[PDB]
C-alpha cells in the first residue's frame, strides 16, 4: 500500500530531515478535489451526464455539480444551470487517485518536459492539470466526443509549501 509506506517511512524521514520536536509538524495531505467546468453548450451537449458517470465510476464518492454563484454575461447562465462537476475526496480514494496519477497519468502523457517549478499559490497549495480524458487506468474510450482534461489540487495542514515540494519529491514527482 502506498499510504502505508508513506505513513511508515516518509513521516519519519521528514521528521529526521526537518527538526520539529513534534511528530505532527510534518505536512500531511488533507484531501483532493476534482472539477472540470463545462462551456460548450447552453444546457445540453451530452447533458453533462457522461463526465459525471465516468467520475462516479472512477471514484468512490458520489459526484455533485455546483450552481451559478455569479451571473454570466457571455452566455445565458443564471441561477443554477449546472456546469462542471465537484468531488472532494479523502481517505483511501485520495491515495488511489494519487497512485493512478503518479504511475499512469503522467507516464501516459504523450510528451512531458518536467514540472514542479512554480505550481504554488504562496500559501501551501499545489495543482495538477491534465489535458487528456484517457489518461487514467479507469476510463473508457467510448465517452463524450470531445476529449476533456481535468484539474486537481493538493493542500496540507500548514502553508510552508517548500516542505510540500520535498514530500512530493519523496512521493514520485517530476522535478
Amino acid at each position: 500500500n502506498l499510504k502505508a509506506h508513506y505513513q511508515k517511512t516518509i513521516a519519519k524521514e521528514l521528521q529526521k530531515s526537518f527538526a520539529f520536536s513534534s511528530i505532527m509538524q510534518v505536512p500531511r495531505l488533507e484531501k483532493i478535489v476534482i472539477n472540470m467546468g463545462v462551456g460548450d453548450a447552453i444546457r445540453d451537449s451530452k447533458f453533462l451526464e457522461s463526465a459525471l458517470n465516468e467520475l462516479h465510476l472512477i471514484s468512490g464518492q458520489k459526484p455533485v455539480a455546483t450552481k451559478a454563484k455569479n451571473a454570466i454575461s457571455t452566455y445565458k447562465l443564471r441561477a443554477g444551470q449546472l456546469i462542471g462537476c465537484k468531488v472532494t475526496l479523502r481517505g483511501e480514494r485520495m491515495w488511489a487517485f494519487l497512485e493512478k496519477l503518479i504511475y499512469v497519468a503522467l507516464p501516459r502523457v504523450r510528451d512531458f518536459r518536467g514540472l514542479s517549478l512554480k505550481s504554488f499559490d504562496g500559501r501551501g497549495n499545489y495543482t495538477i492539470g491534465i489535458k487528456e480524458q484517457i489518461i487514467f487506468p479507469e476510463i473508457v474510450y467510448d465517452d463524450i466526443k470531445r476529449i476533456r482534461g481535468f484539474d486537481v489540487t493538493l493542500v496540507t495542514s500548514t502553508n510552508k509549501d517548500s516542505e510540500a515540494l520535498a514530500l512530493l519529491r519523496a512521493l514520485n514527482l517530476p522535478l
Binding site: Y103, P107, F112, P137, N172, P174
Partner: peptide, 14 residues
C-alpha cells in the same frame, strides 16, 4: 492486472 508502456520507476526524469 492491466499493463502500461511506462511507469514512474522508468520515468525519463528520475
Amino acid at each position: 492486472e492491466i499493463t502500461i508502456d511506462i511507469c514512474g520507476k522508468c520515468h525519463p526524469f528520475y
